Amino acid sequence: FVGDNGFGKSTILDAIAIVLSWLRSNIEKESKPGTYIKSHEVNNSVDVEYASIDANIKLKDFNTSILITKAKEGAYYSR
Amino acid sequence: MWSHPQFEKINKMNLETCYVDFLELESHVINEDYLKESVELQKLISTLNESKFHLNKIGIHDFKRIRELQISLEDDLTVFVGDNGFGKSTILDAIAIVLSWLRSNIEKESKPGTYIKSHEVNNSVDVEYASIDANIKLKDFNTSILITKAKEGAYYSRNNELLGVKKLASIYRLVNKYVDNASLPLMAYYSIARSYIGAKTKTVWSKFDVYDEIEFDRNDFTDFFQWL
Amino acid sequence: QLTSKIISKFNYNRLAFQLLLNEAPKKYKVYYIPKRGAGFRVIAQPTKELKNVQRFIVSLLQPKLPVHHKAMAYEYKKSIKDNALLHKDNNYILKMDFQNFFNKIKPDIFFSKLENTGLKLDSFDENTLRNLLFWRPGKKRSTTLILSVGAPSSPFISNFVMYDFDKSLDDWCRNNGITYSRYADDITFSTNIKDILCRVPKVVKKMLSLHVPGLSINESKTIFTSMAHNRHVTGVTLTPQGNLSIGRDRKRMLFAKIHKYSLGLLSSEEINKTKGMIAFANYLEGDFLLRLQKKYGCELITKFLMEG
Amino acid sequence: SVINTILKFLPEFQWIKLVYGDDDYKIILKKGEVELDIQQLSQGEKTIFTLVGDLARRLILLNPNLSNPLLGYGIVLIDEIDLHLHPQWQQTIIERLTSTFPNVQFVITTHSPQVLSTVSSRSVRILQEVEVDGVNDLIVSHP
Amino acid sequence: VFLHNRASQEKLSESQTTINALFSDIQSLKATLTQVIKGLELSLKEKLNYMKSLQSGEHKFNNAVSLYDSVINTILKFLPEFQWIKLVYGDDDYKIILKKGEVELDIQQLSQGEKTIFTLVGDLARRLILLNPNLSNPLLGYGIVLID
RNA sequence: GCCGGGUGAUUAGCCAGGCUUAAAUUUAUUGUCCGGUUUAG
Ligand SMILES: Nc1ncnc2c1ncn2[C@@H]1O[C@H](COP(=O)(O)OP(=O)(O)OP(=O)(O)O)[C@@H](O)[C@H]1O
């Protein structure tokens, strides 16, 4: 990844780090919790309600997908 | 907390009917300007604003010392008088317990509140469970709630009734969605632990920080200083 | 012998009946129905092939199981009006109801009660009965059976089950001058004596624990009322004079509907809508049609009645 | 408004100020003719300071649109209102609490007869112990 | 707890050669040590201290049971409502049981009113019984107490 | 005394306009396509 900008290329790596943590937890024990998205990481714009991250893992021809989402406080709908 | 085809029934001006009418209307229109300027929203807001929060009555069965008892509370001021060991605190913790589920359901729906501890049920031989019931009246709208726990060692189940609180909380969240600076009710509890009173440089303040806990203890004093 | 009669009537071979016996507790459909207000309700209903063998079983078992005479639900020649006629001349009224009444009835208590009546049945009869009248929610390893509602055989079983409770509570309430009556999972008491209705909540709880284990009282639906406020019993209002009534709001509902009909401004759907309500009100009161004729005239009412 | 609200319950003080020190902030009072610090107050004044300050902060935070935020709705529960308070302050705490926040429901438990001398008869419930039918139980009686 | 164990072992006997048994236990501890080290040494010293019961050997008029009864009746003097107080052993632990009316209560279930009195009186009599090990009635020493 | 309930009559009529009557602090109307009750083709 190449370029300079205010958002910072580091944050993308953080997103991947969150996803892999869930995979590790389930290996240690069944249905063990992973790492959640804290409320202060959601965007502060007035037209947002929730944040999400989508990832996919390929193993030969075996495909898996994971979605992680969190909604702001006081939202009408939960995710 | 869902939609309906608005069964006609008979003419009425209940808050629930306005809530259902708005829910039915919003399922068709897509433009937000029309929704934000519709007359149904104005009716819902005016009805919610003029209504006054007021807890109506409470009943206790088999909880701590009290065996069976019902109270009615005035809308402005009530005082309990008694000696030591007469369950003056028990009523206050019962009310805090029932109010915690309403506090929880406003932050995010389907979120649990406070349960009954296993050592609160009565110590007599013939008891099997304990329960608490309450009722909240918004002028002409009535809700009720029951919380119960079975004694350890028994093999018969009991559940809770949480339709009323979930329905009431959905109205508050829906109004909060379409209004910039909508208000919220105030719930507080000043226990006997005010004696204990004697940072990361927070920069953002909102109305949802006071909903972290119903009781007052420790760091609230610290935050008061930072706020001042 | 019950399996033989079912086989003879429906012409079932050994293999087909064995398969039906094995797969019976899973032929149910779960769906939602809207609520008057806001919310939803959940129902479960069996298939067509199981319903008409449940009705046959009920018709076979009806003349052999006693039922108390104070239960006015799902009974022949009984209705709401006969329920309300008991409390029509008393002052103070108290109402209570249970908590998840239907799904607290299990085959253990059904067979326990059935053994006490003196009716002896073989192992085959017990096996066929257990696998035919009960529902199994959850996975195939649940091994839990409940009655549910929406099945033609549940109401009779529940009425037969609550016989002892009805009998024991009846003679306790009679000795203290209190009237008592039960409709499905609703119980009502009424009397004229002051400060006597504050003692029954502990009595009913003791009776429930003694005579039918498992059941319990929903404590958030207990009501006390007198002649100074609104009084009604299962949907019919009691005027202070002591007469049954439908309510002033519905009377003006119908008077306005008919007046708007006289101008020919009513859709065809509302005619069939209002005709049933008018018939029900006439049955409940007994003089609604006379008042309508005395106000709008027989020619218009007769034309409206014969319409459609 | 916050400062005067706090000063409403402590008539013996003159003003409250916030003074920036070299490395820290300080709250300075003035009692009589001597300036005081928040750590040099008695237990009673500390209790009143914390109670009123917390109530005002909660009300202001919850009602931003109102011109006067002290008129919100809600319910407040207090246990043993007469902690660390002399009888002179015991007689007037109730009417000041009710006058400052007029649209808030209050539930209060007390222990002493001094407060009972200044409450209407329609808002008093008295607990008692009575053995009925061989079982001891608690009852509530209106005056 | 310690005063109760001493009361049971000393006055109510049921201990036989307690000193010899404690010495044998210390000998077994030494044999195990020959066969965490600091903890084992501390336990061995504790066993020797227990074996020193014969060295102490007082069993005087102010025995353990007399002190236990004096403490219990002293506490019960300030709480007229209650009936009796006991120390119950169960689930490999000790707990305090109080009787009020017809219901037995633990210590967690009391109100603040009797919690304050029980704590203050218990600590005051603890210090009086502990700092005057020679008086016939230990609640007769001298001192100064400040209460706010 | 006051307030809150019951309702025959009244009105291009589900609002309103009148006359009666009731009282311990003390109801805020409910689930269909199943079951039984009412009417009808
Ligand atoms: N499980 C229980 N079974 C029976 N009685 C209990 C139980 N738990 C508590 N109690 C009773 O509760 C009483 C104290 O209750 P509570 O603390 O509500 O009263 P209070 O002294 O008026 O309160 P406070 O001083 O905390 O304001 C004790 O005297 C005890 O007998």
GROMACS .gro file of N, CA and C in nm, chain B residues 127-226:
model
  300
  206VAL      N    1  -4.229  -2.118   5.081
  206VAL     CA    2  -4.216  -2.032   4.964
  206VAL      C    3  -4.158  -2.112   4.847
  207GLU      N    4  -4.184  -2.064   4.726
  207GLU     CA    5  -4.133  -2.129   4.606
  207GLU      C    6  -4.068  -2.030   4.511
  208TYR      N    7  -4.110  -1.904   4.517
  208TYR     CA    8  -4.059  -1.802   4.426
  208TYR      C    9  -4.092  -1.665   4.482
  209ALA      N   10  -4.039  -1.562   4.416
  209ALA     CA   11  -4.068  -1.424   4.451
  209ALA      C   12  -4.096  -1.344   4.325
  210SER      N   13  -4.180  -1.242   4.338
  210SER     CA   14  -4.222  -1.163   4.223
  210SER      C   15  -4.242  -1.017   4.264
  211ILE      N   16  -4.231  -0.930   4.164
  211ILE     CA   17  -4.254  -0.786   4.178
  211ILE      C   18  -4.330  -0.740   4.055
  212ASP      N   19  -4.431  -0.655   4.075
  212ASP     CA   20  -4.510  -0.603   3.965
  212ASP      C   21  -4.524  -0.452   3.978
  213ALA      N   22  -4.541  -0.385   3.864
  213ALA     CA   23  -4.549  -0.240   3.865
  213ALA      C   24  -4.634  -0.193   3.747
  214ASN      N   25  -4.660  -0.062   3.746
  214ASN     CA   26  -4.744   0.002   3.645
  214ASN      C   27  -4.706   0.148   3.628
  215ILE      N   28  -4.697   0.190   3.502
  215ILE     CA   29  -4.661   0.327   3.465
  215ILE      C   30  -4.771   0.386   3.378
  216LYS      N   31  -4.819   0.504   3.416
  216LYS     CA   32  -4.931   0.570   3.349
  216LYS      C   33  -4.883   0.701   3.287
  217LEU      N   34  -4.895   0.710   3.154
  217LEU     CA   35  -4.869   0.831   3.077
  217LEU      C   36  -5.003   0.897   3.042
  218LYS      N   37  -5.060   0.965   3.141
  218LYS     CA   38  -5.188   1.034   3.129
  218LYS      C   39  -5.303   0.938   3.105
  219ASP      N   40  -5.311   0.883   2.984
  219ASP     CA   41  -5.416   0.789   2.948
  219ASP      C   42  -5.361   0.659   2.890
  220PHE      N   43  -5.230   0.636   2.900
  220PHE     CA   44  -5.168   0.516   2.847
  220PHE      C   45  -5.110   0.437   2.963
  221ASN      N   46  -5.140   0.308   2.970
  221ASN     CA   47  -5.101   0.228   3.085
  221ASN      C   48  -5.009   0.115   3.044
  222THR      N   49  -4.904   0.094   3.122
  222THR     CA   50  -4.813  -0.018   3.102
  222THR      C   51  -4.792  -0.088   3.236
  223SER      N   52  -4.747  -0.213   3.228
  223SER     CA   53  -4.726  -0.295   3.347
  223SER      C   54  -4.607  -0.386   3.324
  224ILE      N   55  -4.552  -0.438   3.433
  224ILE     CA   56  -4.432  -0.520   3.422
  224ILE      C   57  -4.421  -0.610   3.543
  225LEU      N   58  -4.377  -0.734   3.519
  225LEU     CA   59  -4.360  -0.836   3.622
  225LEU      C   60  -4.220  -0.897   3.613
  226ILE      N   61  -4.153  -0.907   3.727
  226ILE     CA   62  -4.020  -0.967   3.738
  226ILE      C   63  -4.026  -1.073   3.846
  227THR      N   64  -3.972  -1.192   3.819
  227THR     CA   65  -3.986  -1.299   3.917
  227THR      C   66  -3.866  -1.393   3.910
  228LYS      N   67  -3.844  -1.463   4.021
  228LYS     CA   68  -3.738  -1.563   4.030
  228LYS      C   69  -3.783  -1.679   4.117
  229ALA      N   70  -3.752  -1.800   4.072
  229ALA     CA   71  -3.785  -1.922   4.144
  229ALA      C   72  -3.675  -1.959   4.241
  230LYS      N   73  -3.714  -2.018   4.353
  230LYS     CA   74  -3.619  -2.056   4.457
  230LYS      C   75  -3.526  -2.166   4.407
  231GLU      N   76  -3.399  -2.156   4.444
  231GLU     CA   77  -3.301  -2.256   4.403
  231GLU      C   78  -3.336  -2.393   4.462
  232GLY      N   79  -3.326  -2.496   4.378
  232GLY     CA   80  -3.362  -2.631   4.416
  232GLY      C   81  -3.496  -2.676   4.364
  233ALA      N   82  -3.583  -2.583   4.324
  233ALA     CA   83  -3.712  -2.619   4.267
  233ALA      C   84  -3.696  -2.659   4.121
  234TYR      N   85  -3.802  -2.718   4.066
  234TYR     CA   86  -3.800  -2.770   3.930
  234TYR      C   87  -3.920  -2.723   3.850
  235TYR      N   88  -3.971  -2.604   3.880
  235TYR     CA   89  -4.082  -2.545   3.806
  235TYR      C   90  -4.043  -2.405   3.761
  236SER      N   91  -4.067  -2.376   3.633
  236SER     CA   92  -4.013  -2.257   3.569
  236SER      C   93  -4.109  -2.139   3.579
  237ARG      N   94  -4.052  -2.019   3.577
  237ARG     CA   95  -4.128  -1.895   3.569
  237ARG      C   96  -4.055  -1.798   3.478
  238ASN      N   97  -4.131  -1.720   3.401
  238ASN     CA   98  -4.076  -1.625   3.305
  238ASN      C   99  -4.114  -1.482   3.344
  239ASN      N  100  -4.069  -1.387   3.263
  239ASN     CA  101  -4.098  -1.246   3.283
  239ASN      C  102  -4.186  -1.193   3.170
  240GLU      N  103  -4.262  -1.088   3.200
  240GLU     CA  104  -4.348  -1.020   3.103
  240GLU      C  105  -4.282  -0.888   3.064
  241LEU      N  106  -4.231  -0.881   2.941
  241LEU     CA  107  -4.156  -0.763   2.897
  241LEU      C  108  -4.214  -0.699   2.771
  242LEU      N  109  -4.343  -0.718   2.743
  242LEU     CA  110  -4.403  -0.654   2.626
  242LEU      C  111  -4.422  -0.504   2.646
  243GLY      N  112  -4.467  -0.464   2.765
  243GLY     CA  113  -4.498  -0.324   2.788
  243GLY      C  114  -4.376  -0.234   2.782
  244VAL      N  115  -4.267  -0.275   2.848
  244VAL     CA  116  -4.148  -0.191   2.850
  244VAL      C  117  -4.088  -0.180   2.711
  245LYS      N  118  -4.081  -0.291   2.637
  245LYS     CA  119  -4.026  -0.285   2.502
  245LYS      C  120  -4.110  -0.194   2.413
  246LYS      N  121  -4.243  -0.201   2.428
  246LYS     CA  122  -4.329  -0.117   2.346
  246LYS      C  123  -4.311   0.030   2.382
  247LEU      N  124  -4.304   0.062   2.511
  247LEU     CA  125  -4.288   0.201   2.550
  247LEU      C  126  -4.153   0.255   2.504
  248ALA      N  127  -4.047   0.175   2.517
  248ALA     CA  128  -3.914   0.220   2.477
  248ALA      C  129  -3.906   0.246   2.327
  249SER      N  130  -3.981   0.170   2.247
  249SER     CA  131  -3.972   0.191   2.103
  249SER      C  132  -4.027   0.328   2.064
  250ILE      N  133  -4.127   0.378   2.137
  250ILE     CA  134  -4.181   0.510   2.108
  250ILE      C  135  -4.075   0.617   2.131
  251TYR      N  136  -4.001   0.605   2.242
  251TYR     CA  137  -3.898   0.703   2.272
  251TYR      C  138  -3.788   0.699   2.167
  252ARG      N  139  -3.749   0.580   2.123
  252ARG     CA  140  -3.641   0.575   2.024
  252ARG      C  141  -3.689   0.628   1.889
  253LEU      N  142  -3.815   0.603   1.855
  253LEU     CA  143  -3.865   0.651   1.727
  253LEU      C  144  -3.874   0.802   1.726
  254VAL      N  145  -3.921   0.862   1.836
  254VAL     CA  146  -3.926   1.008   1.841
  254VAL      C  147  -3.785   1.065   1.840
  255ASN      N  148  -3.692   1.001   1.911
  255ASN     CA  149  -3.554   1.048   1.914
  255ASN      C  150  -3.490   1.043   1.776
  256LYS      N  151  -3.540   0.958   1.687
  256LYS     CA  152  -3.478   0.947   1.555
  256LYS      C  153  -3.507   1.068   1.467
  257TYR      N  154  -3.630   1.121   1.472
  257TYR     CA  155  -3.674   1.225   1.380
  257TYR      C  156  -3.669   1.366   1.437
  258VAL      N  157  -3.623   1.383   1.561
  258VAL     CA  158  -3.616   1.514   1.624
  258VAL      C  159  -3.473   1.538   1.668
  259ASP      N  160  -3.425   1.661   1.646
  259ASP     CA  161  -3.284   1.692   1.669
  259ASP      C  162  -3.247   1.680   1.816
  260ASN      N  163  -3.327   1.740   1.904
  260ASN     CA  164  -3.291   1.754   2.045
  260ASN      C  165  -3.404   1.708   2.135
  261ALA      N  166  -3.457   1.589   2.107
  261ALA     CA  167  -3.565   1.534   2.188
  261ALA      C  168  -3.516   1.506   2.329
  262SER      N  169  -3.605   1.523   2.426
  262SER     CA  170  -3.573   1.502   2.566
  262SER      C  171  -3.598   1.357   2.606
  263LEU      N  172  -3.555   1.322   2.726
  263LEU     CA  173  -3.569   1.188   2.780
  263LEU      C  174  -3.604   1.198   2.928
  264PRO      N  175  -3.668   1.095   2.984
  264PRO     CA  176  -3.701   1.099   3.126
  264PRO      C  177  -3.577   1.083   3.212
  265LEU      N  178  -3.591   1.123   3.338
  265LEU     CA  179  -3.481   1.120   3.434
  265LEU      C  180  -3.510   1.017   3.542
  266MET      N  181  -3.415   0.926   3.564
  266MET     CA  182  -3.426   0.824   3.666
  266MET      C  183  -3.296   0.822   3.746
  267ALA      N  184  -3.308   0.823   3.878
  267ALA     CA  185  -3.192   0.832   3.965
  267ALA      C  186  -3.221   0.761   4.096
  268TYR      N  187  -3.114   0.728   4.168
  268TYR     CA  188  -3.125   0.657   4.295
  268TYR      C  189  -3.007   0.698   4.381
  269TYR      N  190  -3.036   0.750   4.500
  269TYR     CA  191  -2.934   0.799   4.592
  269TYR      C  192  -2.934   0.707   4.714
  270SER      N  193  -2.854   0.601   4.706
  270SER     CA  194  -2.849   0.501   4.810
  270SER      C  195  -2.776   0.556   4.932
  271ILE      N  196  -2.759   0.470   5.033
  271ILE     CA  197  -2.689   0.510   5.154
  271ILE      C  198  -2.539   0.519   5.134
  272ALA      N  199  -2.488   0.478   5.018
  272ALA     CA  200  -2.345   0.478   4.991
  272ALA      C  201  -2.294   0.613   4.943
  273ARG      N  202  -2.365   0.723   4.968
  273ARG     CA  203  -2.311   0.855   4.937
  273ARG      C  204  -2.199   0.894   5.033
  274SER      N  205  -2.177   0.814   5.137
  274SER     CA  206  -2.068   0.837   5.231
  274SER      C  207  -1.933   0.818   5.162
  275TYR      N  208  -1.924   0.721   5.071
  275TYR     CA  209  -1.797   0.691   5.005
  275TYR      C  210  -1.743   0.809   4.925
  276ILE      N  211  -1.827   0.909   4.896
  276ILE     CA  212  -1.781   1.024   4.819
  276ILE      C  213  -1.668   1.095   4.892
  277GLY      N  214  -1.680   1.108   5.024
  277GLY     CA  215  -1.583   1.181   5.103
  277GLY      C  216  -1.611   1.330   5.104
  278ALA      N  217  -0.783   0.942   3.337
  278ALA     CA  218  -0.892   1.031   3.300
  278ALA      C  219  -0.907   1.039   3.148
  279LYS      N  220  -0.793   1.032   3.078
  279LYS     CA  221  -0.784   1.032   2.933
  279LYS      C  222  -0.835   1.161   2.869
  280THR      N  223  -0.866   1.263   2.950
  280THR     CA  224  -0.903   1.396   2.902
  280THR      C  225  -1.023   1.389   2.807
  281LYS      N  226  -1.137   1.349   2.864
  281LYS     CA  227  -1.260   1.341   2.787
  281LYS      C  228  -1.295   1.475   2.725
  282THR      N  229  -1.340   1.472   2.600
  282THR     CA  230  -1.371   1.594   2.526
  282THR      C  231  -1.514   1.600   2.473
  283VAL      N  232  -1.588   1.490   2.473
  283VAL     CA  233  -1.721   1.484   2.413
  283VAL      C  234  -1.822   1.451   2.522
  284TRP      N  235  -1.929   1.529   2.528
  284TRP     CA  236  -2.038   1.508   2.622
  284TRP      C  237  -2.168   1.486   2.546
  285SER      N  238  -2.249   1.392   2.594
  285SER     CA  239  -2.378   1.364   2.532
  285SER      C  240  -2.478   1.327   2.641
  286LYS      N  241  -2.604   1.310   2.600
  286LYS     CA  242  -2.708   1.278   2.696
  286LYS      C  243  -2.711   1.130   2.734
  287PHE      N  244  -2.634   1.046   2.666
  287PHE     CA  245  -2.636   0.902   2.692
  287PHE      C  246  -2.529   0.858   2.790
  288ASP      N  247  -2.446   0.950   2.839
  288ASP     CA  248  -2.349   0.914   2.942
  288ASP      C  249  -2.415   0.897   3.078
  289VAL      N  250  -2.525   0.969   3.104
  289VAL     CA  251  -2.596   0.956   3.231
  289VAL      C  252  -2.681   0.830   3.237
  290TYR      N  253  -2.688   0.754   3.129
  290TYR     CA  254  -2.764   0.630   3.125
  290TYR      C  255  -2.677   0.507   3.144
  291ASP      N  256  -2.551   0.525   3.184
  291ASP     CA  257  -2.464   0.410   3.208
  291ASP      C  258  -2.512   0.329   3.328
  292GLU      N  259  -2.556   0.397   3.434
  292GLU     CA  260  -2.599   0.329   3.555
  292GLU      C  261  -2.706   0.413   3.623
  293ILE      N  262  -2.796   0.345   3.694
  293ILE     CA  263  -2.904   0.414   3.762
  293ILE      C  264  -2.858   0.469   3.897
  294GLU      N  265  -2.763   0.402   3.962
  294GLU     CA  266  -2.717   0.442   4.093
  294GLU      C  267  -2.604   0.544   4.082
  295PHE      N  268  -2.584   0.618   4.191
  295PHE     CA  269  -2.483   0.723   4.198
  295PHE      C  270  -2.369   0.676   4.287
  296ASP      N  271  -2.248   0.673   4.232
  296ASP     CA  272  -2.133   0.629   4.310
  296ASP      C  273  -2.003   0.669   4.241
  297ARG      N  274  -1.909   0.718   4.322
  297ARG     CA  275  -1.769   0.738   4.289
  297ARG      C  276  -1.744   0.834   4.173
  298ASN      N  277  -1.727   0.779   4.052
  298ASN     CA  278  -1.670   0.859   3.944
  298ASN      C  279  -1.764   0.969   3.896
  299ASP      N  280  -1.891   0.966   3.935
  299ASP     CA  281  -1.980   1.075   3.897
  299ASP      C  282  -1.932   1.206   3.956
  300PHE      N  283  -1.880   1.201   4.079
  300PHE     CA  284  -1.824   1.322   4.137
  300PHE      C  285  -1.708   1.370   4.053
  301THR      N  286  -1.622   1.277   4.010
  301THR     CA  287  -1.507   1.318   3.932
  301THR      C  288  -1.554   1.383   3.804
  302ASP      N  289  -1.655   1.324   3.740
  302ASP     CA  290  -1.698   1.379   3.612
  302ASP      C  291  -1.765   1.513   3.634
  303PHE      N  292  -1.837   1.530   3.745
  303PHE     CA  293  -1.899   1.659   3.770
  303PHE      C  294  -1.795   1.769   3.765
  304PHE      N  295  -1.677   1.744   3.824
  304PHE     CA  296  -1.574   1.846   3.822
  304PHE      C  297  -1.531   1.876   3.680
  305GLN      N  298  -1.510   1.771   3.601
  305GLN     CA  299  -1.466   1.792   3.464
  305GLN      C  300  -1.573   1.866   3.386
   0.00000   0.00000   0.00000
